[PDB]
Structure 1
Amino acid sequence: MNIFEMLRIDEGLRLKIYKDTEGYYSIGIGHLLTKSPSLNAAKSELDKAIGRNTNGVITKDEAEKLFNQDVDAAVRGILRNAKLKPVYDSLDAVRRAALINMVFQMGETGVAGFTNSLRMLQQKRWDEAAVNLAKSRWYNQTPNRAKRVITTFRTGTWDAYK
């Protein structure tokens, strides 16, 4: 298992524009296009990102390409973020993938916000962090996904994805 396979299970893959869990326009493997409620605003963003008139549909390749860009961006954002980096640096490889999954889903800013959980993680207080992470809108809205990620932080194994 690795980050790519992990996110691929969490996000799925769709080749046509779709509404995500929050009702926003997305495509491929969890690639947000736009938060605007306009399908045309979506299509526009889509063509701009692929560099062709897609008309709302992309290939498997195109999707994987956006995915690769998106994972790269998450990692680099973590590395760039004063609050996140130190947490990342402190973790093991499995747990680093769980942090990346969160940043991919919610954004760097959204995650940097989990102050208390972040601190618990840096301290390696696993069971505490897990409890704290569960008290969040994130867990209430996407509970199955959140449980997978939390179990991952809890254990340092990939069992939730097995």
Structure 2
Amino acid sequence: MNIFEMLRIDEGLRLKIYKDTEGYYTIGIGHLLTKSPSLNAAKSELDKAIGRNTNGVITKDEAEKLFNQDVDAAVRGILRNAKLKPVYDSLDAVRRAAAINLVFQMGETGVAGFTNSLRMLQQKRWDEAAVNLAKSRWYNQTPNRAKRVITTFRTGTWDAYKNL
């Protein structure tokens, strides 16, 4: 288990444009295309991302390429965030993966609302942080995924993923 395998489980793999949990056009392994209700706008974003006229369908290799880019950009974004970087740096590798997962899911919305949770994580108050993380729209809207991510933050193990 690593961040790629973890996010692949949480995001799934679809080769045609579909709507995510929030109703937004997405493709591949959790690659959000747009928040616009226009399918044509989503198709245009897809073409831009892939570099060809896709008409809403991609290959597995193309999906994996976007996924590599998206994971990389999530990590780089964390490191460029002056407030978030210290929290990330304080974590072990397994909990770092949980942080990348959350950042990936939140996308452009970001994680500023998680400030109190992130402080508790930095303090290594794992059970307290887990309780605080669940007091969120995130947990309520995607509780199974949030429970997996929270267990990863709480324990620093892959227990919520390894036996699926």
TM-score range, shorter chain: over 0.9
Identify the residue that residue 154 of structure 2 maps to in structure 1: 154
Deviations 1:110-135 (A, max 9, x none): 21321100100000000000000000
Are the equivalent residues in 2 in contact too, given 1:84–1:112 (CA < 8 A)? no
CA distance in 2, matches of 1:108, 1:123: 26
1:37 & 1:108 partners in 2: Cα distance? 17
Match of 1:35, SS state, is: coil
Kept in 2, the 8 Å contact 1:77–1:108? The answer is: no
Match of 2:55 in 1: 55
| Distance change in 2, residues 1:109/1:24 (3 Å) | closer
Structure-1-length-normalised TM-score: 0.98
The answer to whether the Cα contact below 8 Å between 1:148 and 1:161 also exists between their aligned partners in 2 is yes
Work out whether 1:105 is the aligned partner of 2:105. yes
Contact 1:16–1:28 under 8 Å retained in 2: yes
Structure 1 residue runs of 4 or more that deviate by more than 3 Å after TM superposition: none
CA deviation after TM superposition for structure 1 residue 95, in Å: 0.2
Aligned-CA RMSD value: 0.8
Structure 1 residues 80 and 109, CA gap change in structure 2 (3 angstroms): farther
In the aligned structure 1, how far is the partner of 2:21 from the partner of 2:83?
Answer: 27
Compare 136-145 and 79-88 and name the one that shifted more. 79-88
Are residue 38 (structure 1) and residue 53 (structure 2) matched?
Answer: no
**Is the CA contact 1:74–1:104 (under 8 Å) kept in the aligned structure 2?**
yes
TM-score for the superposition, normalised by structure 2: 0.97
Task: Give me the whole-angstrom Cα distance separating, in 1, the residues matched to 2:9 and 2:137.
Answer: 21
Relative to structure 1, the CA distance from residue 34 to residue 8 in structure 2 (aligned partners, 3 Å threshold; closer, same or farther) is same
Alpha-carbon separation, structure 1, partners of 2:117 and 2:29: 27
Q: What's the % identity of the aligned pairs?
A: 98
Q: How many residues align?
A: 162
User: Contact between 1:33 and 1:42, CA under 8 Å: does it hold in 2?
Assistant: yes
Rounded to whole Å, the distance in 1 between the matches of 2:105 and 2:56 is 22
C-alpha displacement of 1:109: 5.0
Task: Give the whole-Å Cα distance in 1 for the aligned partners of 2:64 and 2:79.
Answer: 23
Shift of 1:83: 1.6
For residues 109 and 79 of structure 2, the distance between their equivalents in structure 1, rounded to whole angstroms, comes to 13
- Whole-Å Cα distance in 1 between the matches of residues 109 and 28 of structure 2? 23
* 1:60-84 deviation line (CA, Å, top 9, x unaligned): 0000000000000000000000121
